[PDB]
Amino acid sequence: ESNLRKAFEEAEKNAPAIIFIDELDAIAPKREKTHGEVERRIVSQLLTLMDGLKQRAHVIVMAATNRPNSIDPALRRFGRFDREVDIGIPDATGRLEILQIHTKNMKLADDVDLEQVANETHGHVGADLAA
Amino acid sequence: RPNRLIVDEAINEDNSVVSLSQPKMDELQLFRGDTVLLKGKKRREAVCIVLSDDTCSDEKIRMNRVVRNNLRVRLGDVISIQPCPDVKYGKRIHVLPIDDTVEGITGNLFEVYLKPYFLEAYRPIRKGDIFLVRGGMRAVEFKVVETDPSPYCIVAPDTVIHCEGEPIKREDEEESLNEVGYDDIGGCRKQLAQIKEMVELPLRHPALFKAIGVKPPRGILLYGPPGTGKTLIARAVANETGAFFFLINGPEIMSKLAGESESNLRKAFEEAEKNAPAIIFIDELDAIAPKREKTHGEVERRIVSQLLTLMDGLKQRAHVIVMAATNRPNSIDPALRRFGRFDREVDIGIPDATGRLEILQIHTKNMKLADDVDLEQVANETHGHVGADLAALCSEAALQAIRKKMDLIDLEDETIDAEVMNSLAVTMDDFRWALSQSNPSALRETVVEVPQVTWEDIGGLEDVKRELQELVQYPVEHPDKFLKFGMTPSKGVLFYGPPGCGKTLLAKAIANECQANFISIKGPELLTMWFGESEANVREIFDKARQAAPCVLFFDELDSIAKARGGNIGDGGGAADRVINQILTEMDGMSTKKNVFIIGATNRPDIIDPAILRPGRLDQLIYIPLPDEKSRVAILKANLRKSPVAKDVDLEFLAKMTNGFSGADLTEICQRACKLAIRESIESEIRRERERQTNPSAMEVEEDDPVPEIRRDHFEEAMRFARRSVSDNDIRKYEMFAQTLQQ
Amino acid sequence: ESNLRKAFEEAEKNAPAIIFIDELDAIAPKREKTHGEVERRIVSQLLTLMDGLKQRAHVIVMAATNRPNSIDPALRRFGRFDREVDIGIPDATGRLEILQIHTKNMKLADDVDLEQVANETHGHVGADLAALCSEAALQAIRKKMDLIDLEDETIDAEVMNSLAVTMDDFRWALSQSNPSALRETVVEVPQVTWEDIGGLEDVKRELQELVQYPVEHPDKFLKFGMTPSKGVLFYGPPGCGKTLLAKAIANECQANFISIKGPELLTMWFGESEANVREIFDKARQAAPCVLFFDELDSIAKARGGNIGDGGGAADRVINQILTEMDGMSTKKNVFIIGATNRPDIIDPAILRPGRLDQLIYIPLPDEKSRVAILKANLRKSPVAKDVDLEFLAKMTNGFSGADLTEICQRACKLAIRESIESEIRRERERQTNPSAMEVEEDDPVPEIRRDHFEEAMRFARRSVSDNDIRKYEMFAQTLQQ
Ligand SMILES: Nc1ncnc2c1ncn2[C@@H]1O[C@H](COP(=O)(O)OP(=O)(O)O)[C@@H](O)[C@H]1O
């Protein structure tokens, strides 16, 4: 817990900041999935820190999760995570755009048709087109 | 003495009015326009003007917040109305603001706050007072720090206002006018008249309860959905009666350390014990005191049993009221609802359509709306919003109106000029934009309200109308005759008749007539907990009806569960009894003191189990017939509440062509006929708009051609194809059952 | 644990004491409900202290628990909590006694009838009638607030002795009160008398022949190895008064009456274990003598009868439970069993066995003479229908069930209510023309019930029980008879 309490501390004395809590469902799972006691201390240490924002320097806090079902439902009230944005997998014309970003540095020969590679690779996400 | 009265809050602001009864000024040698001197505690004086009031009593004086604060009094105290109409004109005034209200404003405050405030008002002012000015976007309060001649002076058209200087630091003896009060709650008129009647006496005058020797309240439990304004009722009550509101929170008690959480509760009650009549608010009770079987550890059993022993330790001493707020009153440990503990329970439901309008007029009081926004329209189309959501909608409509004006304020300075702020205005376009990206939070929740359906909304069937009027109004409006005789008024009524004849409309209309709440439980909802989920659900729905007396409970499609039993297997026949068995188990337990009316609708009267029909329960059988011809001139008329005036439509001619129909299908024929008319107007204007491609704004200017008119020649074309829902086998199946019940 | 050890220390060195352990089920719950270890330490710390009470000082220890099921069964052996006393909720005449205790200090005015407030507040416990008396004084001082407005810290005595409490305040305090008992098994002596029912004097005698003397004259039963019948089954057409007979006899012998309805039987018929049958009989044991009543006991059998009846395996569960702990009755305790059913063909022959309920008393349709008496009993409210000539009532409407006769008059009075409503509706709208032109004081025609409405009300009658139903009972009656 003392790592969370000193994580929001620096963001309060360091100008308009943005805090990013990655893999939220690893530290704030569903209440019925919490069996022990130290994993009910982390969640309630996170909840009391969100409500303590006294119109601060506009410390925006964003979190990333895989499935909005698994997040503890207490993190949906007002004053907490309320605005939700959906980042879906790229479509057939999206995947052509990821290719032209990563291959920008490389020196392609004049025989590669990236459109052909774009429309064939259904099932890939942004990270697989970087490998 | 004919001077000391009681005070009460105001409605029409106006920081310089007090309301007095006509005889009071008549016997107190007072006249119109006479300035009066008011004197109260701490030897403070405030100068005001008096005026008549239509409904003011002799011993009560109505005045707003600002005048009360200056006198340093509270609700229900005594004041001196000593009159003196002699004030010499002031020569030069020095008015300066308070520090923590003009943060990053600057500009000339005189010509945008004070100039429209003193203009043609002749306000009488006194040294040392405070007044509040509703600015263009904020609420800035000032403090008269010097006057000439001192201290009584009335602002005149020829004075010298010196609004220059650094703001005064906030003192220690004030109420901080920019804080919550009884006028900052809307849609909670009834509930705030119960928390106020059971709390003012122990907190305002404590000494009385010691002499009388009776038991004060020691716990109030407010429940409702989150965001409906529960912690604002506790903060409003503490700020006006005079108390020591000390909030303890749910989450930060549960997450302090190991066994040190209990030492936070033990020393939280200590301040409330040695700091005058206090009020403690335990927010989110269900986070620290859940059911016994959800407590899987041991340190969650230590906190609960530490909360119980502190509540039982409150025996007299100082008066300490402890309120708690919980979402669902089923999740709280059932050992807390005993006596000497949380016993009085208040319900704060979601606001209704006339409530959502009042939340709007509270949050938008500061802003300056343009003259095209009709708050009635925004109020009635936002069903599913709680009080906290409408406070975000009124904020998004402001950010958008400044988003489209950022050029005037391009980077400005650290402080934004007050002239541009007063130039802003929000329109209906912004509000429609703020509603789009808004997610209401109530949605799926049982709504309790008085439906607006009137008697005229249903055509015919007046014989049933008188019958149902007998069983509802007279047993509750004229009880003395029923007090005589061992009469048992019917506790239920059953409807059976052909489908789509308007059974639900009859139940709705009665609730509107008697002005009682309406609760509807549908068929598919009734089979929701029929399988798997326990029968615990069927309990609170009766407690929900019980607390909201008077009410008219409604069961829709009662025979749905029996139909599932009928089949190739029907393995749920005993399961189908589970929901049924709970229904009779929780229907014979109602008392006559509370009134609850149960109405059940069905369409297969031969398939209902005989157990349901029995004396003492819902037993009056009423057969709703199919509308008989002439009735359709009232059913089809009930769909002409739109504007389908089809020239010489001759509804009498339209009445005779319709023969042997039902009530639901007739509504469809009006909708189906209109749909063709709507489409036909489209091909018109499509023809009209493509004709404009030749003549540029010369021949064709939309000269009332397409226009909503609705035509007779379009009405009958849809009628050629219509599905007669009058099944000969089905209607015969009901009538011989009607005769069987008749004979 | 060191708090319990130092709690019994004073009682052992401070004279004859008495210890009271409130809310015992919070520290000694059932074994399976104990999951941790620190809550298995407290229980075994309480058990080793009770066994150490060997003479020395005379320390009695009582404990209060809500439900004896939830107490850990280890606290039932000898040398531990063994004597058990049951404090039930007050009855209709009990609640009048709680009122006169708490209102002793107050100064009631000469208009409050405490008996009226006592009999209409069913569902309240002792503690709840103490709040009702408190808010009837707070309301009656809130209305005199002007005389004692603020005043000072000390209140004069005369302004207190000028107070009074009326019925209005008591009626006001009743509205905002939530009784806490409600859904609880009500057991007490019913007030129904023999005369409340008409006819069936042959069965009226027979019930007295089966229950009354086997407990008042047991010396003659000591001679002969008689095993007096422990159960009686009533069967007949539905709505004929079986429940009335069982209520009346309990009043005649002055024994507690415990009723079990059909839906209650189906509550634990599914899913829930058969521990619900445990204390249902155990309530009867402690409250001896008592007349247990089983109503619609063939409902479980009827549920089995159907398209599938997959509850047949569940059906034998309850019948086994009833049969298991009903042949175990002892002749020392006086617990009497009575059953009622309207479909005697479906009940399994198993319960129809010697040693169990075996007397099958057939309740017939009401007799012609009885139909006259049934009318008079239910119409003892105030039906003065001038020259009614009620002897007409029975003869024209022959062959009617008992429950139907009660219904037909309830509707008849229902229309009579309407006529009186329009009677004063006409008067009040006629009063709009004459302003207070009443030399004599009269407001209503003072219920002047006529006779003409009764025959008009008879028009909507119903032949519910038909020839088909009555034939089945008689042929089964002849089956038993021959
Ligand atoms: N009249 C009202 N009724 C309900 N809510 C209101 C009203 N006026 C304002 N509100 C908003 O409701 C919110 C209640 O505060 P909050 O603690 O967030 O919710 P809750 O009180 O339900 O826990 C406040 O932020 C306030 O802005």
Ligand SMILES: Nc1ncnc2c1ncn2[C@@H]1O[C@H](COP(=O)(O)OP(=O)(O)O)[C@@H](O)[C@H]1O
């Ligand atoms: N005065 C009326 N008489 C007959 N039917 C009507 C009347 N007003 C509306 N209706 C039709 O009755 C329908 C309502 O049906 P409802 O009674 O709720 O269904 P159910 O009979 O299955 O409960 C509406 O769709 C409407 O078209």
Ligand SMILES: Nc1ncnc2c1ncn2[C@@H]1O[C@H](COP(=O)(O)OP(=O)(O)O)[C@@H](O)[C@H]1O
């Ligand atoms: N002497 C009587 N004989 C038959 N029925 C009576 C008599 N007195 C009253 N009744 C009516 O008959 C009904 C029978 O109900 P009850 O005896 O409680 O159960 P059941 O319907 O199983 O007999 C009662 O509601 C009562 O109103």
